[PDB]
Amino acid sequence: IKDYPSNEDLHERLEVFKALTDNGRHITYLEEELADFVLQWMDVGLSSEFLLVLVNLVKFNSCY
C-alpha cells in the first residue's frame, strides 16, 4: 500500500484488473485514483457492481 500512483493510459483493457484492484479501499486517495480510472464512457456491460461505494461518496460522487 502506497500513495505512489498506479496510473496507466492503455487501450480499452476490458478486463478484471480494475475489479481486482477495486476491492478493500476505504481512504480518500484510494477511491480518488481508483474511480479516476473510470473510462468516462457510457458503458457498464463489463460489470455493474460498486454501487454502495457511490452512495458513500459525496463530492467525488458529485463530480463523478
Curated annotation (Swiss-Prot):
Coiled coil feature spans: none
Tissue expression: Liver, brain, heart, lymphocytes, fibroblasts, biliary epithelium, pancreas, skeletal muscle, kidney, lung and placenta.
Subcellular location: Lysosome membrane; Cytoplasm, Cytosol
Post-translational modification, as annotated: Phosphorylation by AMPK activates it and leads to negative regulation of the mTORC1 complex.
Function noted in UniProt: Catalytic component of the TSC-TBC complex, a multiprotein complex that acts as a negative regulator of the canonical mTORC1 complex, an evolutionarily conserved central nutrient sensor that stimulates anabolic reactions and macromolecule biosynthesis to promote cellular biomass generation and growth. Within the TSC-TBC complex, TSC2 acts as a GTPase-activating protein (GAP) for the small GTPase RHEB, a direct activator of the protein kinase activity of mTORC1.
Subunit: Component of the TSC-TBC complex (also named Rhebulator complex), composed of 2 molecules of TSC1, 2 molecules of TSC2 and 1 molecule of TBC1D7. Probably forms a complex composed of chaperones HSP90 and HSP70, co-chaperones STIP1/HOP, CDC37, PPP5C, PTGES3/p23, TSC1 and client protein TSC2. Probably forms a complex composed of chaperones HSP90 and HSP70, co-chaperones CDC37, PPP5C, TSC1 and client protein TSC2, CDK4, AKT, RAF1 and NR3C1; this complex does not contain co-chaperones STIP1/HOP and PTGES3/p23. (Microbial infection) Interacts with human cytomegalovirus protein UL38; this interaction inhibits cellular stress response mediated by mTORC1.
Implicated disorder: Tuberous sclerosis 2: An autosomal dominant multi-system disorder that affects especially the brain, kidneys, heart, and skin. It is characterized by hamartomas (benign overgrowths predominantly of a cell or tissue type that occurs normally in the organ) and hamartias (developmental abnormalities of tissue combination). Clinical manifestations include epilepsy, learning difficulties, behavioral problems, and skin lesions. Seizures can be intractable and premature death can occur from a variety of disease-associated causes. Lymphangioleiomyomatosis: Progressive and often fatal lung disease characterized by a diffuse proliferation of abnormal smooth muscle cells in the lungs. It affects almost exclusively young women and can occur as an isolated disorder or in association with tuberous sclerosis complex.
Protein name (Swiss-Prot/TrEMBL): Tuberin
Annotated organism of origin: Homo sapiens
Full-protein residues shown: 127 to 190 of 1807
